[PDB]
Symmetry: C2
Subunit: 115 residues, 2 copies
């Protein structure tokens, strides 16, 4: 807490409105919750809206729902009502409403494997 | 900048969702823009939505429009299309979306007097 430096910072072009982060798990697991941690020192760099793309095959992303508004949140916790298999998870992050830089502290993919 | 302490901090009760700040000008002036500065060190304490109540008589508040969403903004600038007389300005500030404390740095009422 109060690290004052973003772990990952993205610079937005003026034409660009969505930044993609794609996580390829080594094997397909059941996915229940996804936790995204914005930068606590500056919530101006927090994304305005985050939609979540998952893929059971890992190459064809069939996402989950509408984009969730994440403005003014110290911690983004996205929880699935239905747990679904996902060998790859892609995250489209919108441009922040005021700042032009995207600040993320940590991305967590919580779930269970079989066997 | 980076003062790390809010100039004014409000503690929210769990039942309370709106906090009112009422500014009584000594004389009625034309009002064009209202500038509200949230706490720059922590935008978790920034209000989620701010509606603006003005009053020409100063005792009967006839507000201006729907509440403006202010989540994730380093600076709240509210500008009137039509300048209206206002001897008193009241500001209802919503509870922040994540934090339970309201952090404001400065409130500015920009306008013109006659004569």
């Amino acid at each position: 807490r109060r690290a004052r430096s973003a772990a990952w910072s993205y610079i937005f072009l003026p034409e660009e409105a969505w930044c993609d982060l794609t996580i390829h798990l080594p094997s397909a697991v059941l996915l229940k919750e996804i936790h995204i941690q914005p930068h606590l020192a500056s919530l101006a760099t927090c994304p305005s809206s985050v939609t979540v793309e998952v893929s059971a095959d890992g190459v064809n992303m069939l996402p989950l729902s509408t984009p969730v508004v994440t403005s003014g949140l110290t911690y983004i916790k996205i929880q699935l009502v239905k747990a679904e298999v996902a060998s790859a998870v892609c995250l489209r992050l919108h441009r922040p409403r005021d700042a032009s830089t995207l600040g993320l502290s940590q991305i967590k993919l919580l779930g269970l494997t079989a066997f």
